[PDB]
């Protein structure tokens, strides 16, 4: 049995919406966002983590291509391997590819492990969002209705399950019979609902929302 509604913002576990700009780094924002919530849960402090650290440093060895795209899973693996990720304040976002400038002096989080969830299992995604925290996912955002979304529960008939844009599921709910996922985007505050989009839930893995979910953990010790 799971709660009907979850919103991790209400628990102080979600940083401000970021603005990725011309750099295709949504995969990096998806990853730091999920890790930011685990960090808050563990330490009580809400700290933006460095998406730029991932763009510059979680590169070819991790199958990623910086501003040309990447994976949250291998972003997490880089953080594990690196034994750290810097704070965003110490290593801020420039929306461009740069040399890796990681400096452990400003490490703001670690990552013990990450977990991947089954493709298309929206019931499994729901349990993880409720019991673990915000979950990194990909969505199919290659539709003008996505770029032009303003408000409400987003449903795009021509959406597919093949994902191309990283986002953060920070909750879910039901608005008078329309079930939705609460999704943090990285297109700044003027996109959608103060930078968030509520996306149709339990509608056959709509827009691939549960195609590739993953979440990191920071274990005691
Ligand atoms: O959607 C479908 C089919 O339904 N995909 C085909 C299979 C697939 C897809 C994704 C996936 C998940 C999240 C995101 C996003 F959130 F960022 F948006 C994306 S965006 C595409 C990211 N890409 C762009 C070109 C390159 F720069 C490499 C990164 C894709 N993961 N996987 C599974 C594996 O292939 C992952 N791989 C396993 C071996 C080790 C490395 C990771 C896309």
Swiss-Prot record:
Keywords: Cytoplasmic vesicle, Disulfide bond, Glycoprotein, Hydrolase, Lysosome, Protease, Secreted, Signal, Thiol protease, Zymogen. GO terms for biological process: adaptive immune response; antigen processing and presentation; antigen processing and presentation of exogenous peptide antigen via MHC class II; antigen processing and presentation of peptide antigen; basement membrane disassembly; cellular response to thyroid hormone stimulus; collagen catabolic process; extracellular matrix disassembly. Disulfide bonds join 13-111, 23-67, 57-100, 159-207. The keyword Disulfide bond applies. The active site is at residues 26, 165, 185. GO terms for cellular component: collagen-containing extracellular matrix; endolysosome lumen; extracellular region; extracellular space; ficolin-1-rich granule lumen; intracellular membrane-bounded organelle; late endosome; lysosomal lumen. Its main location: other. It catalyses: Similar to cathepsin L, but with much less activity on Z-Phe-Arg-|-NHMec, and more activity on the Z-Val-Val-Arg-|-Xaa compound. It comes from the Eukaryota. Its EC number is 3.4.22.27. One of its GO terms (molecular function) is laminin binding. Transmembrane segments: none annotated. It is found in: Lysosome; Secreted; Cytoplasmic vesicle, Phagosome. Monomer. Thiol protease. Key protease responsible for the removal of the invariant chain from MHC class II molecules and MHC class II antigen presentation. The bond-specificity of this proteinase is in part similar to the specificities of cathepsin L. Belongs to the peptidase C1 family. This is Cathepsin S. The chain holds residues 114 to 331 of 331 of the full protein.
């Amino acid at each position: 049995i799971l709660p009907d509604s979850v919103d991790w913002r209400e628990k102080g576990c979600v940083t401000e919406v970021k603005y990725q700009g011309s750099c295709g780094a949504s995969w990096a924002f998806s990853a730091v966002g999920a890790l930011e919530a685990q960090l808050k849960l563990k330490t009580g402090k809400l700290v933006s983590l460095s998406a730029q650290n991932l763009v510059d440093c979680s590169t070819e060895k991790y199958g990623n291509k910086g501003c040309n795209g990447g994976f949250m899973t291998t972003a997490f693996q880089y953080i594990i391997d690196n034994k750290g990720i810097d704070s965003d304040a110490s290593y801020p976002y420039k929306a461009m590819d740069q040399k890796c400038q990681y400096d452990s002096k400003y490490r703001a989080a670690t990552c013990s492990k990450y977990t991947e969830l089954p493709y298309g299992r929206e019931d499994v995604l729901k349990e993880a969002v409720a019991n673990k925290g915000p979950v990194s996912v990909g969505v199919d955002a290659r539709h003008p209705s996505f770029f032009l979304y303003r408000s409400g529960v987003y449903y795009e008939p021509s959406c597919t399950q093949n994902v191309n844009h990283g986002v953060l599921v920070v909750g879910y709910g039901d608005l008078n019979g329309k079930e939705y996922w609460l999704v943090k985007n990285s297109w700044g505050h003027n996109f959608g609902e103060e930078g968030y989009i509520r996306m149709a839930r339990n509608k056959g893995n709509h827009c691939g929302i549960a195609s590739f979910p993953s979440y990191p953990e920071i274990l005691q010790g």
